[PDB]
Amino acid sequence: MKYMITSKGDEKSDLLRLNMIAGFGEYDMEYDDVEPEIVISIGGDGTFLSAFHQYEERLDEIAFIGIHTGHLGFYADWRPAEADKLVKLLAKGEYQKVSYPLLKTTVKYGKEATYLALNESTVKSSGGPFVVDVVINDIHFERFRGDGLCMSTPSGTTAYNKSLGGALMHPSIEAMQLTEMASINNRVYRTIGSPLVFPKHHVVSLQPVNDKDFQISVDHLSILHRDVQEIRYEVSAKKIHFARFRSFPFWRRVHDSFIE
Amino acid sequence: MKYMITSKGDEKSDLLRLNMIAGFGEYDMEYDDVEPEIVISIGGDGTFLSAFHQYEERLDEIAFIGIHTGHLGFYADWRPAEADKLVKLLAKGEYQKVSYPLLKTTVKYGKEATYLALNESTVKSSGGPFVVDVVINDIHFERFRGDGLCMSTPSGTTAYNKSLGGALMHPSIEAMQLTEMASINNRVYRTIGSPLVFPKHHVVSLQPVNDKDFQISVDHLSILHRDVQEIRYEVSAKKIHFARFRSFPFWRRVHDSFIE
Amino acid sequence: MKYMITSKGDEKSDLLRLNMIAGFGEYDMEYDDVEPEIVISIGGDGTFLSAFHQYEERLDEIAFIGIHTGHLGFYADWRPAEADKLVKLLAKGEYQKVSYPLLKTTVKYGKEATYLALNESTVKSSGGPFVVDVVINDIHFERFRGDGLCMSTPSGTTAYNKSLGGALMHPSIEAMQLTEMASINNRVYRTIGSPLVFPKHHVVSLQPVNDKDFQISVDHLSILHRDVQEIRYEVSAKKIHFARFRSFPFWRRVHDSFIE
Amino acid sequence: MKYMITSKGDEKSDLLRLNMIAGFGEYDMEYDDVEPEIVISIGGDGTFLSAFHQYEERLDEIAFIGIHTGHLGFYADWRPAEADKLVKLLAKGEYQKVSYPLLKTTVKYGKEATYLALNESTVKSSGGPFVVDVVINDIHFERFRGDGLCMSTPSGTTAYNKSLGGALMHPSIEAMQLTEMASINNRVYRTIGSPLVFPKHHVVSLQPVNDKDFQISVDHLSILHRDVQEIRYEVSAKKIHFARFRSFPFWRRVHDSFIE
Ligand SMILES: Nc1ncnc2c1nc(Br)n2CCCCO
Ligand SMILES: Nc1ncnc2c1nc(Br)n2CCCCO
Ligand SMILES: Nc1ncnc2c1nc(Br)n2CCCCO
């Protein structure tokens, strides 16, 4: 089928890419980076994220694969020594696919911009104090005061979510998790404190109180949005598809990255 | 149908019980506390828990209802002023039912004892140091050192789970959440720290390292178990059923209890 | 003596200022905002902070006083109804003074800039990843990876420090407290996690690893510093002096602000 | 002078004790475990704690020394390979001494019992719910609801205090730190959450609300006290004295134990 390979750009990653291409040349495979069916990332999780966002509009047409040249990653979870055996089983096809949920972020202005996040989306102030009203399924839940908020995907919970006290969530759970960043709690400002986990079809919207300018991040991309009326979060109907090469459980991946 | 009513035992709760019984006497309803179809709890969440455990073996035959005479509860979420309108719509039937997931706890000895928890199950030491190996789906995840662990249901996340930094989880999510209690982390002992959320059919087992005696709690019940070989957790195949009286969302329930 | 009064600028604060000035006119007191001996702040804690920084170079010549027109503050801790009795005992003099410790921040470039903080000083990245080596009394303590760090004064622990999990410290303790902001901890990056409390004459220096540009805050002032070689923290030899009007304990102040 | 040596009791520790005694026999030193001037602990921090509590009544007459046969400890901070050079400089004397603060715990009944803690003192319930009123310098600060409380010494902050989110405090600071254990916080029960650090001469007293039986720990010793009227904490006027063998800073000790 059609395939393509992105590289971190350093020496080891570029050479592993060329060796896999040459190996692919021994099969009924053609290199197409416009309409690929297989997208291979070589580098780290960040390299995988860029590969994800390069092909956001063809997610249901692509099975992704990640190779880590550095330390183990949660998306780049195959060692370089498995590249040759990766090429062989990829070329035959007949492999299984696994799907992770994604987070949809909609921003409303005085038009409307929608983004897809594989890890998380964060909202911070543009300089002054960050204050938003949190509305869950149209009911006002809290007035949040602090540094900002973070809405994470399941597989994103091992990233920024984890640093903010969030729980680690198995990616087979179609959910999204919201965590707080340095919240103020006194007798006048009150926040839940606890991380919140939302199921599918629940809608979490952030609404400004004073300043309508916010710094909004979506994975690597961080952009200052102005005259924002609403930021609403929900589990996306779209999913990312991975090619299943062998058994590498999420919890084993979690153990290897944080325990030993 | 057959119904019964439990009471906290104080003055207000006993009188509300007798008024509802008299009101029920105006309908095709008979009081049976052996094989009831409707179980009404009057008091607090603790009163509801006891009502739950009184009828553990007939969960799929019973729709529970909670009335709080004191402050609002997460299971006893109807005010006493709604008792008369509760009696009327209960007697007709034709009401909707909602179901929450439950946690199954299995304890193995050198026989085997199984329990059902509506909120959570905790494991602590019997006096000395608490040390267990945590095994997830047969792979060794961590050696936990500290005060103990807590495995919570979705609806249980607003109880003890919340106090231990756990996330709040919508009860429509079939999952269980594991949190740590005062864990030791140095260069030799390592724990994940983060709360873990497990989907259905994932099995979390605790295995002793030195002492085989543990203080095991299941909701209100706390029992010292001796010569324990294994404690394994998993989302139960059984569910608790609530009679749906009107719209009282979980997140609104969360807001009322903790925010305002 | 010479005195001056700053105001939040809103209606209630300007009117309370004019009433206190008129009351002061009934005594041997002259209004001098160049070399005042008494500085009265009317508004909130932020109004007090600006009053503090307006007169940084004459701290040992000035006894500060804070009046809150809004909610209670930790520096503006006198109600407006006490203004007339404040004017009277201030004009006589013979009052007691209390002193709080201050934090000295030194920034080194490829000259050198020194600041005094009443609450805290924070260091964040300029956009990319924030990475610094933490050096305590010339020994390398940790390589910090995350959002940033916060070094707080004792009286500053009830502000930003508190939101980051820091401890609340009685201001009679000559110390400074360092807290982490969303730190990364895996098998390769390690941080202490815990807040650190340093005594007098201990020096904490932050040293860049890659990017030498940092966003440095000192109370309200937040400035982007470029080509930074070192940021070193230590308890200042200077102290802020408050005029003691009656008994308002720090722990009572803490209770009123956060408990009830 | 008079000296004695305690041992963990395992093989390596008993043999190191006998070698140091034989080495001491080459000097003007006599073994007295009744009125020793030097107390050497061989094993771990727990071995040092028992050595501390064996000689509580002669603290100002004794300079303690800790040797770790296992991993590094905060009190047993000298390697076994330094035993021979330890014996030599100990026998001459003329060494420097360093002093750490201690925590005094007073328990009142319906007589009165006082204890000295080197690490911390914890209070938990005897089975049911733990509820106490917290009174600071005679003013009521909070009604605490949860698992329990922990009052730590400076050098004790690296133990249990650290696991409960407490700050790490340099032992030259004469202070005590109070942390919470799994506290309940809703709209009706309120706690400060943050750890509290108290200076010398501040008195923190715990007072029962319902149950007057509490499980009180002081370092290793944990005892069930009945009919308790009050538990009050304060920094002790007594201090533990260490013999200063060379430069081993607390922060270096902290780095070695938790970072690398
Ligand atoms: N999903 C993930 N889980 C754990 N680490 C991840 C991650 N995605 C990325 Br990119 N990283 C590493 C950089 C950010 C670290 O906070
Ligand atoms: N599910 C729940 N959510 C919040 N509170 C609950 C609860 N169940 C019970 Br009983 N309570 C109150 C007593 C325990 C408080 O920690
Ligand atoms: N020292 C302090 N303690 C508690 N609140 C303070 C404070 N100084 C200021 Br300004 N504030 C309020 C604004 C910042 C809130 O985080």
Ligand SMILES: Nc1ncnc2c1nc(Br)n2CCCCO
């Ligand atoms: N002061 C201390 N600092 C760090 N560890 C200590 C300690 N005292 C003891 Br005993 N230990 C180890 C056992 C308890 C671990 O929580």
